[PDB]
Amino acid sequence: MSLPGSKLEEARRLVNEKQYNEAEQVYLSLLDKDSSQSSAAAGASVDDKRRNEQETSILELGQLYVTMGAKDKLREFIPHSTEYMMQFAKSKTVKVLKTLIEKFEQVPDSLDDQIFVCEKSIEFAKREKRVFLKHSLSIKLATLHYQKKQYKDSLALINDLLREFKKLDDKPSLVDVHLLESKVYHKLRNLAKSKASLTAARTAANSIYCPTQTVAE
Amino acid sequence: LKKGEVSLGTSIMAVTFKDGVILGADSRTTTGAYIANRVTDKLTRVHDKIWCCRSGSAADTQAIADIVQYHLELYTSQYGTPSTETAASVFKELCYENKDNLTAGIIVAGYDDKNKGEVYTIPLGGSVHKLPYAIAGSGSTFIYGYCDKNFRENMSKEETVDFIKHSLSQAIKWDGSSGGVIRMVVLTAAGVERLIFYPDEYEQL
Amino acid sequence: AGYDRHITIFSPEGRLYQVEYAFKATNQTNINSLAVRGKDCTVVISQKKVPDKLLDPTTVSYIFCISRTIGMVVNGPIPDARNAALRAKAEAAEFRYKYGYDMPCDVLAKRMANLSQIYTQRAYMRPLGVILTFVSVDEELGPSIYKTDPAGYYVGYKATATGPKQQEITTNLENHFKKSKIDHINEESWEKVVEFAITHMIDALGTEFSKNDLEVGVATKDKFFTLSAENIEERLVAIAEQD
Amino acid sequence: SDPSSINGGIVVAMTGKDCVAIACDLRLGSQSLGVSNKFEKIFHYGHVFLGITGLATDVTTLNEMFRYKTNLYKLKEERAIEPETFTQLVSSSLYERRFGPYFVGPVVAGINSKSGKPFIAGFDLIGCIDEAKDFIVSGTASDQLFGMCESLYEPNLEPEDLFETISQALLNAADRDALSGWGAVVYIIKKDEVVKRYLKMRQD
Amino acid sequence: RDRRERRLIFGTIASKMSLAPEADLDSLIIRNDSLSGAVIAAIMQEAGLRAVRKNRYVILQSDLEEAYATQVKTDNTVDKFDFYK
Amino acid sequence: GTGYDLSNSVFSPDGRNFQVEYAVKAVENGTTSIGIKCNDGVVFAVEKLITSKLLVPQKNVKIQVVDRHIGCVYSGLIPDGRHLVNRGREEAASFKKLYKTPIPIPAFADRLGQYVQAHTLYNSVRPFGVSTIFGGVDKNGAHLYMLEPSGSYWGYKGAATGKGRQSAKAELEKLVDHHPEGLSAREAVKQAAKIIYLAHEDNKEKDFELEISWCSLSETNGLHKFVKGDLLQEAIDFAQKEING
Amino acid sequence: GSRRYDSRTTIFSPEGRLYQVEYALESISHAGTAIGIMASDGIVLAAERKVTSTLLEQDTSTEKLYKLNDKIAVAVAGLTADAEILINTARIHAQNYLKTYNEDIPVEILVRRLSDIKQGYTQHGGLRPFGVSFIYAGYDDRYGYQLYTSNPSGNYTGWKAISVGANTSAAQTLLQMDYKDDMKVDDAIELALKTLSKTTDSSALTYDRLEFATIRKGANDGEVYQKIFKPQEIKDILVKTGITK
Amino acid sequence: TTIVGVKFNNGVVIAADTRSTQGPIVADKNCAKLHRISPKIWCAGAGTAADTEAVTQLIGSNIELHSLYTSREPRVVSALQMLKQHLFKYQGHIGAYLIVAGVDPTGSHLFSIHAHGSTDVGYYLSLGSGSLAAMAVLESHWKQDLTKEEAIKLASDAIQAGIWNDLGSGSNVDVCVMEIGKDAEYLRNYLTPNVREEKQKSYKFPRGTTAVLKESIVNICD
Amino acid sequence: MTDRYSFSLTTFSPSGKLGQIDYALTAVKQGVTSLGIKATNGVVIATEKKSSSPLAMSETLSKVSLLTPDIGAVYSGMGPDYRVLVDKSRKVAHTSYKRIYGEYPPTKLLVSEVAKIMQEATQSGGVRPFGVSLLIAGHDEFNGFSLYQVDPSGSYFPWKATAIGKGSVAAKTFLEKRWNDELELEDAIHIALLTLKESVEGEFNGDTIELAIIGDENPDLLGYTGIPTDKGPRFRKLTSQEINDRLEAL
Known part of the structure; x- marks a missing residue:
């Protein structure tokens, strides 16, 4: 009712309790309702505190569209919310997008779903230029080309990154691009250039601290 | 008294009952013919319990009397509240050098647990004195002799309010420079009370 | 030449020798205190030592009344303690003269610190190394404690103390503030809050006292008072009945 | 009456469409006895003019005080100044000394160099703030020009049409007053260049 | 010593000691910077002796923070780091 | 050198500069003067x-009584003790000017401590090297405050200075157990001569002269009196009555 | 204290001169090299910068070289903050001249007036002067162009080619033998660029470390024109003069 | 000069005409008599409008600097003693009746300022030459528990009574609404009681009706 | 009677610089790390707040104050040395063109007048200099945004992206590596977090790291619905939660 968390946590358990459609109609009604603060992420209501709860509702859409195979509709939901994330504080733009892929890459999805929405961030990168977010998505974009078994497009993205890495450091992102580059040259039967990729990755590992998931791989 | 400031005094008075003192005044603000402020309340607060009437210069009682509050916090805040004569003597000093420019009389009636309701009245000349009760102002000219005849020493609560209300009623009706509603204040050990009287009350007595 | 024992110049270590001796020993008085904040009120407790039979306990105090809502906590040399006290009381009345409201914590703490920072500019006049802590209860924001350091450092403090045992009481209070995730004490009934702060004080000391051996005061809403000899003794006896 | 009115003369200023018209007379003297036929009230530094009306003690001598802080603005900022910005220094200088204030109301007229919006300014001798979109004048004969441009000026007039309006109103206003007359010079304020045109009027 | 280096020694000597699962050094790991192996080796000493005084078998998280005062800062004269106070 | 002897504008590790410590030795080398509350x-x-x-008795009086309601006495250096007297009596005259009331003892104490703390801040100003003992009667009651040469002052039921400061106050605590509030202060006047007589044992060189200037809550009620005539020799003979030799 | 730590460096030192003037020459030596040149068609004024980085932004570009008037410029060698006090101070005295005679002031009037400002600190007041050396460049209707150079000691001498900062005697030697009575704007710049390359330890000469503002006679008209060249125009000077690095 | 104000429960509203009259002839048809101390406090005054900014701009800027000084909110009563002691130093030789109203951390306040050193308070306040015309209307229709919409029509009709009954008022009316919860609302040209139409016969002076002697261009820069 | 010491500060050592200034940079290296950048789409002023006690609340401490709505400022080293400057700057700016004109002078010449007083503290007898260096950004009229570094001498430093404080040499090179024609407002925040936060250690939260942006004008900061002749207070500071939200984007 008044508290937006009452209609949220109750609808969160409706997934296993009844079905997907029972909990889906609740989130559609919570979109245009329960104004909070700051700017309007819905456009019919202002979202500041509910934006964290609205992200949870978007994560609940990952239980429906991704499992059933409706991601073609979810693929168009991200650019709809992209224009909304350009109104309020932009700190949530990268934070929400970072949590979308984790649920998106679990189910054995289709390559066209992520490629099309990743190009939308590339098309949006012309007006608003973000070198940190575009290169972060390019790491997972080249991973799709690894499953696509096309190494020509995956190398072109890395070559543009390695050219900028000579004048930069990007130590957390420098190990990841070399870690994925080793997967490209290994399936091509190369024991030399593939080994040189992990060689430069271990150099930056001794300077700063890389995360456990990166050091393990 | 200078140009641009409203003349204080007119109808004012205070009476010391058994233990305490009751200040009173009417509500009017006039420069020569008009009423600028009809809610006017004439009071001066140097302390929670100790109050003072607002007389003489209007600009001085809203500034110099607040300057006395400045000098009062260099003593009271360090130790404690002094007697009534201590705070009333500052009115004599600040008006002594400005006597050739700022001319303001002040009637000081305080409350204390020992000296009780002793009143210290300072005329326009800027001299401190000691009187049990005093009445001043240009609008109270009618009630001067009225309070000096039937007055009784150490009245009760309601009898003192009536003694002041019956007196202030003559200055409101029979004067054109004094009028409005009577706003009193109760000074005693029980606390500080505020009362207001309607024109239909003191008119019929 | 180069020594700060008379004049004041920048040392090769980047730290003034006067600032050192001011920060080193503030405990030459050999006294401790504590300051905590309740919900709508503020409770301060200071140790008191009376090494004579001829001393009037009502005269000796480290807590002076500034405004009606404002207390103060001072530790250091006695003659230099009243130098900042007489100035703060004179500056507290200047707020009403200029404004006519009650002195907020963000002003009185800033004025005394800025006045102490001018002493860094003036080489002839001596600064004060006395601990200055201004405690009061704000109307809008509630309780607030700002400790003014002799070098000009002042910031928000949920709790503060003096002496070498300041860090010992801080450890016990940090664990209680971490679980509750609140800076002040949400518990009402300040009469029981005074006994709550004594418990943390006994852990650092380990002994009891009399009614005149402890300087204790409570800053309430729109009022500040000082506990008398009977009010202090009542709390030291009543704390033994509970725990 | 007014000690600064012993000399006489006024400064008329108007506001057109992308143009500003401001003018004064050449008359200077003492009471009914004239002295200077070459005297010019309008002073210019930057892109904005400055008119001045009153006693030469506060006209020509204080002119060094205007350019005192103006040149410091020019030697430091090395840029232009908005008419609203320079007008505050005018008003503030008059209210520094309330007992001794200067009796010359200036006239300020110019075109904005940033947004390109014509604006006029300038105050009276006490420094009272008067800013409108039509005309701001000063002096003893300024009472005439208050009603002259009401039946003459029209919103959004060309610089040539505005030139004929301010000229015809000033020539007849000087004939009616003993403190104004003896020629009228008119300046046409444009975005960059300013055109000067001398006019002929009744001599005596 | 970085956070990755100090963590390896924490699980070394504490492997032979029975430790409660609710006790963790994350409070002392984040705040501490630029220390040596002596401070780490005494974590098993002072916190171990703290359990001896109270006759405690394991070592809780509270005793880890209580010993933090004597463990790291060895200066008993005046406070520490008087620069910015 | 060390900086504490030449300059009082620096900070000592013990909180008290060596220059302030030299003021203590100057006071202890003076004449013992006690007080009674x-x-x-x-x-x-x-x-x-x-x-x-050549010296004439009953002439030099170190006790300086501000008006009739406040007494004061100093020790050590004469000029540093009388310098405060001119300032203390000037502020008392300025007090009665503004407030037209007599000044209480606690209001008198803050004016003295302000001069000591201000002179220690400036390196060019020489601080006070004497101790101040002052008291009297106010609208409240009996109060006795002693101003140390460092500037620290607080509530004192007894005062001492000169030789055996803490030794002379030992007899004051003996009267606390006998009289909890002190009761009759007239007998204390005879006890005052005995306490001063205690310091006469080691300090005996030449003839001694004792003077007493007091004030009472009951008898005077704010007035001022002086011990003379029979009361002068009665207190002196009491101190010699215990020990005749 | 207030004496032993005061050595009175403003009076006569045992060396027979002022230490504050002698040691200020080293501060001038560490200061950027500013070489003034007075040509036939104008006055060439160049200056260096302190620690030019890649992200250092040049917009106003005036640090050690300012402009007092359209016909009069000024250059300083030393700490920039010390000069900024007297940069606008000479303008205040210049604007007072406008209030006085309502015309343009010759440079020779303000040269000696500012010399007594720093000299007055040594004379009385117990203050200290500035170790910044001044370079004056102006125009006149009698002497034509005027180029002067001051020093913290108060000396002023006319110089057609002057050099301050590091390698003072080294830069003036190359300009002395290469001097010519007839030099235009382009002739004086090519001689200054070759000299500044040997003053510092950097590689050749670039536009970022070169602070250059000069004056000519007229632009559209034939008199009264001066402009401070932007750093974008300084890069084009290297192309016009034929010297790249 | 007619200025009024109304203090309702949720805040205080003030209004001032845009017509300024200096002397027997109108000096300015369109101006702003409502000045600003802090963003939440708007001020008004009678007489010369420049005399107010010769004081308020000095104190109001300090109050805005006092906002970050206390780091909480600007205060209404902080502008009283500053304005009261300022007129006391100069002995109030400039006759003006100021009106200061705003919202402090305590609430809404409407204060009055007299010529010399005197300050008052009231629920509704009108000062200036046209005060007597507007004050009489405020005495007619009033009651307890006033709202925003009720306070607008009360203050608007008070100025209209002053515009019609006094020659020193006219042009339009600028109503400034100050709410406790929200920020201040300033509506310029809220009413249009005075509308001047175009003249009948258009008078256009043709080009060439003057006498031109010389011509030149004023120097700007090279 | 006060101020009897007329003699100046320490005279010239056998160096060529001033020893009072050389020791002043020691407190800067031992102070907080501050930086600044001009992206022309915004100005982000970020610094660190040192908390040496768990009982000290950082809500009262603000290292970035507001002299004028379009000008931000940040300091390093000694904290209270900047607090007294704010009290002096706002009073000198009051006597500055704020009273003279209808607008305060731009950041270029406004700081030069304030920094001129800092140099007077290094000269006149009896006053002593500070140990602090100030990074003062701002928005001018014709030149748009601005950034300037102020030494205790007071010479203006028209930089683009610079950093001071502890580890300034290592943190300055990182700013020189990332540059282009025109940056953005959000990019300057993420670059500062990958520089300021990763340079120091022990404070991972947003209460101990103060960040503010310039160029963003919210309609609620004006306080009036009247005619907006000017945009407004472009200075904006992130709250406690908004700073930690910037950390989750990297």
């Missing part, structure tokens, strides 16, 4: 050491 009033004591028969 009891229920009937506040009694002072002063002694004048006789260097030669």
